[PDB]
Amino acid sequence: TLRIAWWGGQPRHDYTTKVIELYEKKNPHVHIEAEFANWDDYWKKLAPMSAAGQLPDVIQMDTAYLAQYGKKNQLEDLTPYTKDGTIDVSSIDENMLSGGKIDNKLYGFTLGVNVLSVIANEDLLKKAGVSINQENWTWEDYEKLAYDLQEKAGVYGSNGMHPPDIFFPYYLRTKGERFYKEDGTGLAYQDDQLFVDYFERQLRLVKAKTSPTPDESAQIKGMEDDFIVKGKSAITWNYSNQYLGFARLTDSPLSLYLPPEQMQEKALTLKPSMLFSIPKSSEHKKEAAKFINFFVNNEEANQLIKGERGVPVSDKVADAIKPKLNEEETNIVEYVETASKNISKADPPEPVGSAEVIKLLKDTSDQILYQKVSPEKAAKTFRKKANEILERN
Ligand SMILES: C[C@@H]1O[C@@H](O)[C@H](O[C@H]2OC(C(=O)O)=C[C@H](O)[C@H]2O)[C@H](O)[C@H]1O[C@@H]1O[C@H](CO)[C@H](O)[C@H](O)[C@H]1O
């Protein structure tokens, strides 16, 4: 019994089932049991599963949790499988796979590459009479756009920039700063005004009713109820590949735009979108590795995936599936190519303590948006606690 688990929304679950069925057709001795959840529920269910020694054989993994699992003896080093050809890396440049490495070991195999984007509903932009001039626009331009969208189109100008552990670090990079120290022992940025400026802007957007309160965001059941899909927001902040799921769930014309203020500091990164990992507890490690190889290198399988989990890490596969892509699937490839004319290498995997820092920043953001703590005070409390968490590693 080969257990395979991932996070995502309905569009991802639909074709992943077909990829699994295709693997079983080609390998009829294999019976796969699939397990899936949305992002939040996925990590919540995975943690006590790992404590019980019951992780699935193939785990969809994120860089933000790679060290949390890999430095706590949960994950198998995949390097033997790349060395003996079980997972073929001949068409994968090793620089893409390094997003799954912790020090010397390969704890996750990168499945794709993506780039942060501002995704917009073109019909709602037109309703408000507004446009995005993506090459050069500023955070101030974005805030004005969000007010224009609420005042003139009656919709949000932000989906919430959720979660803060993605978009506050993006803001830091637009200002030439960094969230984590390279050694992982504390926060890199030293000027609390950066935190204050970011969360003051979030508070203004919420108070102007152009961005959701935490209680509204918590109501979102699954991807079909996300703001961009229901038309409650004209704007959503997501990775390039996530455009595809949205485009399959709404008829509205959606576009990918470069986020504000990426130009000067090359704030965007070519990020490992997600990974597959194998737990040390697995009784089917070789079969799990063979499934990973199939997922990344099989062209037929990738004609079902169509970049929904990121641009394929195999250049051979990524170019071979381009003729199969339709307009919306091609829009993502075009966006990544455009962003890549001014982009940075991804930062290494997040340090141990990332999982606790993520929740700390979400909790702190909630308190700011409910006006229970000022951004000035929260900057200080966040730094103190984040550094207490990180100094353990
Ligand atoms: C922007 C959010 O970043 C991460 O919290 C997480 O991204 C991971 O998943 C995916 C993916 O599922 O394709 C790509 C990234 O490379 C991963 O690190 C979230 O999934 C991601 O976006 C969330 O998307 C949902 C979509 O319904 C909501 O819009 C939610 O508010 C976003 O946080």
From Swiss-Prot:
It comes from Bacillus subtilis (strain 168). InterPro entries: Bact_solute-bd_prot1, SBP. Belongs to the bacterial solute-binding protein 1 family. SUPFAM superfamilies: Periplasmic binding protein-like II (SSF53850). It comes from the Bacteria. Induction: Up-regulated by growth on type I rhamnogalacturonan. This is Putative ABC transporter substrate-binding protein YesO. It holds the Pfam family SBP_bac_1. The gene is yesO.
